[PDB]
Amino acid sequence: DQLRQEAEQLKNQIRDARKACADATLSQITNNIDPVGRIQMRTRRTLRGHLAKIYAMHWGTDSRLLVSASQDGKLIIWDSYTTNKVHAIPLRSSWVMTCAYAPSGNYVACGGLDNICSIYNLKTREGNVRVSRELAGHTGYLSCCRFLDDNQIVTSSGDTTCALWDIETGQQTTTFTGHTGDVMSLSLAPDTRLFVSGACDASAKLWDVREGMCRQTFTGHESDINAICFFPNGNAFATGSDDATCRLFDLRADQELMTYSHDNIICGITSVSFSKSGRLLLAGYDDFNCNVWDALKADRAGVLAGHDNRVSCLGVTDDGMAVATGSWDSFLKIWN
């Protein structure tokens, strides 16, 4: 087909332009900066109330409350200062794979292997926790869901498309298509304007929330992309693959910046998060550990090893105080 050859020529032109726009890599610029050595963190608290594997976790906006999702059909809200249980919500479908906490603190969303995203309201006048909405319309499993303004929620599924829903009416306001494989994770921008998503076909796409069209795409990996997160500046992001490699992509340069890998590590990443200053990059691995990389030099700076199974979820507070990790051993851990 002539269109296939035209597409190949256009891709070659894009690659040539990307190469031409390049310069000396980030290593040359950051060679002379001071490093940070032995970033040692010790477990402060230990939240033990779950009875099965733990698949998701999200920090509250006040940096004190958090929510965790288990496979026994439980969504638990923890107070991170006294290790107390504020709420324990039982779920209709035990096969969950994600959770989110509203930026105002009123709603919590959970989804999973039943093609439905449930939304629960916390502050009612009867004292209990009621289910507020049940968004349905996806064909594959829900992989990750995030809140925007307590009325709009963006979800990602395992059917190559990710949707944007208006909660009050209950229907897909917008749909985003363009991946070939499953979509595994997404992270909203700090200003909630754009958002990136990683797919199970070794590509990451940047979408504009309004007007609903794919803006950019990046391809540097060799296997599935299993986690993704925005740099706090909002002008870069970090992708964690399934072949023991992390990468830092730039929106404006539209190509790769640096890669984080080691010969000793051969497992697959499961979560990625940053620090308030954008200097430390955490990474939850599959070999029971949790590495802490110096994002400006690629040299490893610390190890968090306290878990008896693979670490599945990882998060950092808004003010930058603590770090929460959660694994398949049914224990969360707060590090500081």
Binding site: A17, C21, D23, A24, T25, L26, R252, Q255, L296
Partner: peptide, 12 residues
């Protein structure tokens, strides 16, 4: 697009 050195300087 901008040059890579600009992105490196901005991140630093």
């Amino acid at each position: 697009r901008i040059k890579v050195s600009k992105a490196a300087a901005d991140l630093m």
